[PDB]
Amino acid sequence: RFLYHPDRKDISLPGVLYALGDPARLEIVRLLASKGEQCCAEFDFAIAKSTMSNHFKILRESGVVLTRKEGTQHINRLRREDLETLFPGLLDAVLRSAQPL
Amino acid sequence: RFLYHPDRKDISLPGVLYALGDPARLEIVRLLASKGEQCCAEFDFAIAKSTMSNHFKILRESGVVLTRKEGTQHINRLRREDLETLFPGLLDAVLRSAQPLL
Ligand SMILES: [Cl-]
Ligand SMILES: [Cl-]
Ligand SMILES: [Cl-]
Ligand SMILES: [Cl-]
């Protein structure tokens, strides 16, 4: 079922901003807010699977993405309820100027 | 006289977020936004000056901070117009959610 996720007390703005500080990690967050839950395979970035796995590990450890294992799929979800509880209005400002890749 | 700064055409939102993705780098920006132009010496948020020299380097090359040499002093300026013309409402959104560390 659910993969590792930090608690809300352990989420910082420097970690969220670090996880959004990559072209791929930001497109993952842009698509997870516009298209809802998505499996890791829908992200067809032309990058190695070692870099993609680390990207999702950063997304999870930062408090931004909640990943779940249902079958053989890795389902990711934007933890927007928790990010708007700590930082109200931040995700919207980042997604305003986020240009689609 | 004026250290490297990227043109507004080459500043990306991911690069700006990576430069605010450090508690020390975010503290520098929050001080440059509240108290104005500050010198690198007014920020001792590290045991190593190499760690601090790399912080301003990331802030400079990412398009957030402009640094200028005035004698024995490097003065740092927040590029507010550039970050607000490209990313409207982002810096104020980041600054209002930042916890003061000073
Ligand atoms: Cl390859
Ligand atoms: Cl998958
Ligand atoms: Cl001169
Ligand atoms: Cl100085």
From TrEMBL, chain A:
<protein>
    <submittedName>
        <fullName>Transcriptional regulator</fullName>
    </submittedName>
</protein>
<feature type="disulfide bond">
    <location>
        <begin position="39"/>
        <end position="40"/>
    </location>
</feature>
Automatic annotation (TrEMBL), chain B:
<protein>
    <submittedName>
        <fullName>Transcriptional regulator</fullName>
    </submittedName>
</protein>
<feature type="disulfide bond">
    <location>
        <begin position="39"/>
        <end position="40"/>
    </location>
</feature>
